[PDB]
């Protein structure tokens, strides 16, 4: 019972005589297969995600700058110089400003002055490429127990998308995988910053307006377009001043707003084949029952219209089968809960079924149980 | 020379007979004055600063959550309470979660679920209001020297608009201020912001989606409207997580591009009439000078067409007054320097005239100095 | 009259910190910058860096640049300098002077008449 | 980083002149050079400051001159007090002060 609890909850019934039933599974999302003569599955993506990205392209959406310097020169001197200029840790603007023999000057005029200031990025996010083959889906899958816990997953790649999951007491099921991206990854980025990942298209996250780096481990860690994050401006025409932009943070979640958020993890959906033939339901062996159950805890409905019935028996025989149907005059009822079975009397035993709709006696025999039910619509 | 060297510089000249000149004063402009038979001088709008703002709101532009803390209840069983949920440090949110017999719950079905975090913000701004009484205007006056300075400035309220200014050896001038604010400062906020400040249209500012309050420090300092920085989501239907924005300054500084940058400081303008009947140019007693000159400096034009000549004297008489006219067929030439004197035969002094256009000659005479000048246009 | 007053003689052995006031009198000490500048026993006069007295923005020299630290006190006209992990080569007179800051607060182009007015000098000595 | 002579000599009533050379970047750049004349033990008193301008107290005998990246103190009448160092100093492109060496100037008797 695996599903039973979760409301965004699938079913999914093969029609007659079917080995197989195809699935799709998305995250959050529970799915139950049945097939006649078979168990009942539950099968869920629980995770998807993606070994080893590389880092394309790293940009910075916060900096500060340090060791301010300038250099100026009278008019008709020449530009202004300053060895920081092919240090690839500054950034500088060039301008001019008023001259005279008040500041030194033999001439009257505009003069050259250059600023230089360190850029130190204080906080960066970055972009990473994703490669098909390095995904993995870790998909779980049970069989819809009847029986109480007592006191498997399969990884698929898209080189291995088809696994061969051993289920203990019913045989073998194969699991049969399509990787279903809505994506093309060489076109799209992950984008991660400050523990949040989302994914966007790339040429948008080249396009977008911050400082960035291919950044190499090999070289120190310099900046291309320092301009987008500082600036310098001329002061009435004597100072020039470097203007710092602020952590662009709250800019960069405001743009993703309309994106898709999330060794790295991610969220897809996966379509899917079961094959079911070297599976059994186990306990078709055993021999329909003989004695009185009782109710263990009272019906309760879930949130599909099914209800849960789990009870305890009374009789002799420890292996045995739970005679079981429901009327109106008697139909048989469908059951998720495959060939209810005693598996030990001692212990309860659950079983799931769907009622028709309006009134339902559900009886489960000499003083068996009538237990009244009623399902709205 | 106060305004020589600055390229940002306007000539104010009165017509025929005026004791009188209006003018107008922006930051980075300077403004020389001149009328016949009267001083020149340089007057300056250097600073205009509001004593004493008053904080109207303060927004918060980048916070921080702590002691989280969620109550839970299965179905039918109302909804989840947290006694922080009065308490105005948190910001919290309900919902609702699967539920069922694996998690505790008789019964299956949605139940609900609140969750509460501390509000904690690291960084804001603030908005002050400010207002036309608590303004003053620096205003400096000086006088177009002539002299070399060997080895002032007015307040201006609006309640004292009107400074009368005394200037030694040459009277007393009296400046009469209006201030021409291009606002309404009821409906324009003072908006700082971690060193560097604007001011905006205030609706603007009330209307900007930034958690609020109006900080009185007789009260710790609680939220309004918490949601724009710290949200909630439900994830997959069981679990809740908080969803902090990140630090809106970078959003706030490309928000604020296209507003007005700048106790406190600003930059607006003035308009002013200087009246100058009291006022006499001093060196009128003297006489007209004996002896010849020579060039200290070479002749110099500044960013305005005029030239600059500074000189040293030859001669007995130690107090005179220095012959000075240039011609193509002489033309009295305009001088800005207005009387050039001599106040000691050991000391240079500079005189600014206005050349015409085309080629002219600059005579300063038994042994004169006649200098060779000439101007574009 | 404009005068400026140093400190007493201070002898320090290597490896401490020094520090060495100048206080103004006679001018608005806010409307200047300080500079300091030291010279060893017959040797030429080095120049350290300034403070503007206004706002406290300082200027360093490349020699001094993480070893020196000029401040203000504008409470008492007062310019402080403080050297830190001194070395054989530290003794020296140390001299403040005076320039005046353009009509904005700022001090970006001296005056002409830069160090028109001085301390008298302090020595510190190495052991 | 500005050089100049290590001594100069002259006798009274004569002129003598020191030369400050620099730099592109401050003293033929700038007329920001000035000279100082310090006694031992004495505080640099400000002699001549934008290479020719002298403050109030110094006597005409001083003056300065620029050429190239050549500053040129002299002294003419030469007396007897004028034995001192004298030091030239200029700002530079890069908004820092230099100064020169100093000289040592003696007048015989």
């Known amino acids: 019972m695996r599903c039973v609890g979760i409301g965004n909850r699938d079913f999914v019934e093969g029609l007659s005589g079917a080995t197989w039933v195809d699935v799709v599974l998305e995250h959050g999302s529970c799915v139950t297969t049945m097939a006649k003569n078979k168990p009942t599955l539950d099968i869920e993506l629980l995770k998807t995600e993606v070994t080893n990205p590389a880092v394309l392209r790293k940009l910075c959406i916060e900096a500060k700058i340090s060791n301010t310097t300038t250099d100026s020169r009278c008019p008709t001197q020449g530009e202004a110089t300053l060895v920081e200029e092919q240090d690839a840790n500054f950034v500088c603007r060039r301008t001019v400003v008023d001259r005279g023999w008040g500041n030194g000057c033999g001439l009257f005029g505009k003069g050259s002055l250059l600023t230089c200031a360190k850029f130190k990025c204080v906080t960066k996010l970055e972009g990473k490429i994703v490669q098909y083959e390095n995904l993995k889906y870790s998909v779980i899958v049970t069989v819809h127990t009847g029986d109480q816990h007592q006191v498997t997953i399969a990884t698929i790649t898209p080189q291995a998308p088809t696994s061969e999951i051993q289920l203990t007491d019913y045989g073998t099921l194969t699991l049969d995988c399509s990787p279903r991206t809505g994506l093309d990854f060489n076109e799209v980025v992950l984008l991660t910053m400050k523990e949040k990942s989302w994914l966007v298209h790339k040429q948008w996250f080249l396009d977008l307006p911050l400082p960035w780096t291919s950044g190499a481990s090999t070289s120190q860690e310099t900046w291309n377009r320092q301009d987008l994050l500082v600036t310098f401006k001329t002061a009435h025409a004597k100072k020039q001043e470097v203007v710092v932009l602020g952590s662009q943070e709250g800019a960069m979640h405001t743009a993703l707003t309309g994106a898709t958020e999330i060794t790295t993890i991610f969220a897809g959906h996966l379509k899917c084949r079961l094959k079911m033939d070297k599976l059994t339901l186990k306990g078709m062996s055993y021999v329909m029952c003989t004695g009185s159950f009782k109710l263990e805890k009272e019906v309760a409905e879930t949130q599909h219209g099914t209800v849960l019935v789990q009870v305890k028996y009374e009789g002799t025989d420890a292996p045995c089968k739970i005679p079981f149907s429901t009327q109106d005059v008697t139909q048989n009822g469908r059951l998720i809960t495959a060939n209810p079975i005693v598996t030990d009397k001692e212990k309860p035993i659950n079983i799931e079924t769907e009622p028709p709709f309006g009134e339902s006696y559900i009886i489960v025999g000499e003083k068996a149980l009538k237990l009244s039910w009623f399902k709205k619509g | 020379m106060r305004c020589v060297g600055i390229g940002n510089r306007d000539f104010v000249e009165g017509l025929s007979g005026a004791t009188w000149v209006d003018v107008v004063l922006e930051h980075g402009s300077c403004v020389t004055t001149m009328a016949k038979n009267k001083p020149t001088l340089d007057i300056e709008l250097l600073k205009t600063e509001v004593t004493n703002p008053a904080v109207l709101r303060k927004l918060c532009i980048e916070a921080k959550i702590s002691n989280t803390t969620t109550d839970s209840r299965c179905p039918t069983q109302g909804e989840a309470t947290l006694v922080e949920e009065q308490d105005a440090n948190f910001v919290c949110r309900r919902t609702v979660v699967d539920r069922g017999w694996g998690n505790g719950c008789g019964l299956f079905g949605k139940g609900s679920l609140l969750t509460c975090a501390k509000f904690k913000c690291v960084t804001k701004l603030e908005g002050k209001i400010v207002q036309y009484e608590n303004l003053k205007y620096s205003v400096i006056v000086t006088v177009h020297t002539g002299d070399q300075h060997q080895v002032t400035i007015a307040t201006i309220t609006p309640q004292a608009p009107t400074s009368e200014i005394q200037l030694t050896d040459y009277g007393t001038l009296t400046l009469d201020c209006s201030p021409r604010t291009g606002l309404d400062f009821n409906e324009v906020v003072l908006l700082t912001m971690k060193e560097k400040s604007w001011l905006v249209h205030k609706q603007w500012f009330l209307d900007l989606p930034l958690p609020w309050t109006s900080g009185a420090s007789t009260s710790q300092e609680t939220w309004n409207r918490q949601d724009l920085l710290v949200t909630f989501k439900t994830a997959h239907a069981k679990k809740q997580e908080v969803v902090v924005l990140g630090s809106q300054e970078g959003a706030m500084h490309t928000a604020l591009t296209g507003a007005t940058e700048i106790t406190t400081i600003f930059a607006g303008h003035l308009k002013c009439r200087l009246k100058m009947d009291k006022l006499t140019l001093k060196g009128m007693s003297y006489v007209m000078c004996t002896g010849s000159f020579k060039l200290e400096k070479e002749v110099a034009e500044t960013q305005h067409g005029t030239v600059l000549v500074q000189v040293k004297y030859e001669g007995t008489d130690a107090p005179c007054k220095i012959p000075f006219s240039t011609q193509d067929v002489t033309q009295n030439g305009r001088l800005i320097t207005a009387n050039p004197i001599v106040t000691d035969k050991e000391k240079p002094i500079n005189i600014e005239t206005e050349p015409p256009f085309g080629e002219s000659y600059i005579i300063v005479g038994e042994k004169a100095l006649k200098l060779s000048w000439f101007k574009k246009g | 009259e404009v005068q400026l007053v140093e400190s007493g003689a201070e002898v320090k052995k290597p490896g401490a910190s020094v520090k060495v006031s100048c206080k103004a009198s006679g001018y608005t000490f806010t409307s200047y910058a300080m500079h300091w500048v030291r010279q060893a026993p017959g040797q030429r006069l080095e120049w350290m860096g300034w403070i503007n007295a206004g706002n406290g923005n300082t200027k360093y020299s490349q020699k001094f640049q993480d070893r020196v630290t000029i401040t203000r006190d504008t409470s008492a006209s007062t310019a402080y300098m403080e050297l830190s992990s001194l070395r054989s080569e530290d003794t020296a007179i140390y001299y403040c002077?005076?320039?005046?800051?353009?009509?904005?607060?700022?001090?970006?182009?001296?005056?002409?008449?830069?160090?028109?007015?001085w301390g008298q000098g302090t020595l510190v000595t190495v052991s | 980083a500005l050089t100049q002579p290590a001594s100069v000599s002259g006798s009274p009533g004569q002129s003598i002149t020191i030369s400050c050379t620099g730099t592109?970047?401050?003293?033929?750049?700038?007329?920001?050079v000035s000279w100082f004349q310090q006694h031992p033990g004495k505080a640099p008193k400000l002699m001549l400051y934008?290479?020719?301008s002298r403050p109030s107290g110094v006597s005409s005998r001083f003056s300065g001159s620029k050429s190239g990246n050549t500053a040129s103190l002299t002294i003419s009448g030469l007396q007897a007090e004028d034995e001192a160092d004298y030091y030239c100093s200029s700002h530079t492109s890069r908004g820092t002060w230099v100064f020169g060496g100093g000289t040592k100037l003696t007048v015989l008797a």
């Open positions: 934008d290479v020719t």
């Open positions: 002077a005076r320039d005046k800051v353009d009509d904005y607060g700022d001090y970006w182009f001296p005056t002409l008449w830069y160090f028109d007015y």
């Open positions: 592109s970047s401050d003293v033929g750049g700038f007329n920001y």
